[PDB]
């Protein structure tokens, strides 16, 4: 197939505040794509939506052929063995240490022998980089090391689609650089097709091969990292560099400022 997940026409509601409205997206395999929007735009819901953990109201999202929404929920686990969410905060299991945290999806699915699984996990830790942190509990880890350990745990099973939910948010540029080198080295070594959803544009566009920008409730722009920073569109031109005033309003709507200034003039 050409693209690994083709979200043809998805409309999601979540109550009354319509999140998406007939959006279209197409992650090609081997290509690390990205989706960007303002904070609170609903983009993490998009990732949770392409993992089958929540249903689109009126949508045909084709993960490598068959739809995700129309799955037995027993077959969905078999295909979900070919995905890997890397949440923010890592989502590391606080019970077990890092080693037993990376080894978790292995022991859950594969029958690797004990000295085989040990060598697999102590190799994926070295891949990500925190191999010395095998026995450190996930509450002792730093803020960025938790995302790295969860990345190592996410590339276990070689998932063929590892999607990153805001991997660089509130991180120093020195750890932003480690996290942007890891998720490029993986795609350039493995065949994983990273879907990096985020809003920290300066770093995401440094690796994204084909990025989408979703406005209030729909996708407004796409294209490569080069043809995007030249887009002549206020809704996109504002967000791509943060001009603090444009189609999104700076001043929250208010009334007349005068009764607010002098109540009962």
């Amino acid at each position: 197939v050409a693209n690994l997940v083709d979200m043809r026409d998805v409309s999601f509601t979540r109550g009354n505040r319509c999140i998406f409205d007939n959006i279209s997206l197409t992650v090609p395999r081997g290509k690390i794509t990205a989706i960007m929007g303002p904070s609170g735009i609903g983009k993490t819901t998009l990732l949770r939506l392409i993992g089958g953990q929540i249903a689109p109201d009126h949508g045909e999202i084709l993960f490598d052929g068959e739809n995700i929404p129309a799955m037995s929920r027993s077959r969905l686990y078999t295909v979900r063995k070919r995905m890997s969410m890397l949440f923010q905060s890592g989502a590391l299991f606080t019970d077990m240490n890092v080693f037993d945290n990376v080894a978790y999806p292995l022991r859950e699915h594969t029958q690797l022998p004990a000295p085989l699984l040990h060598s697999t996990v102590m190799m994926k830790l070295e891949a990500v980089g925190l191999r010395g942190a095998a026995k450190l509990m996930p509450s002792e880890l730093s803020g960025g090391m938790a995302r790295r350990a969860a990345l190592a745990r996410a590339i276990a099973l070689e998932p063929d689609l590892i999607m990153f939910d805001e991997p660089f948010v509130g991180q120093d540029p020195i750890t932003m650089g480690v996290l942007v080198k890891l998720i490029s080295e993986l795609n350039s070594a493995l065949g994983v097709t990273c879907v990096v959803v985020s809003h920290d544009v300066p770093e995401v566009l440094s690796i994204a091969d084909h990025a989408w920008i979703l406005a209030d409730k729909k996708i407004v722009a796409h294209g490569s990292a080069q043809a995007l920073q030249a887009n002549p569109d206020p809704r996109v031109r504002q967000f791509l560099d943060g001009i603090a005033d444009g189609p999104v309003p700076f001043r929250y709507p208010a009334g007349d400022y005068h009764a607010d200034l002098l109540p009962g003039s």
């Binding site: 594969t110 029958q111 085989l116 190799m123 070295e126 099973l157 080295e185 070594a189």
Partner: protein, 94 residues
């Protein structure tokens, strides 16, 4: 989907997928499999995953256990790519 190793002299000609799935049957008799084998040739191996790489590491280690300068032929470029990822030292993989 398939995996099969043949001791054909001083060579361990293994052929298959060499991944986390088909890895089981080879792991057991790993000792006698690499008993008198100088070089291991993994040429008829379509792809190799992390678990298969770990098994290959252990096979090499066993070849050096009894004492044997091992060499690898027929390996893919993808295997050496994956090994460059995991930073495997040049004295365990060769």
């Amino acid at each position: 989907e398939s995996l099969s190793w043949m001791q054909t002299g001083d060579t361990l000609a293994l052929s298959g997928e060499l991944d986390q799935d088909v890895l089981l049957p080879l792991w057991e008799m790993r000792e006698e499999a690499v008993k008198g084998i100088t070089c291991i040739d993994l040429s008829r191996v379509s792809r190799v995953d992390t678990g298969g790489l770990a098994l290959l590491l252990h096979l090499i280690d066993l070849a050096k256990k009894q004492g044997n300068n091992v060499t690898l032929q027929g390996v893919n470029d993808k295997v050496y790519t994956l090994a460059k990822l995991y930073n495997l030292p040049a004295d365990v993989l060769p």
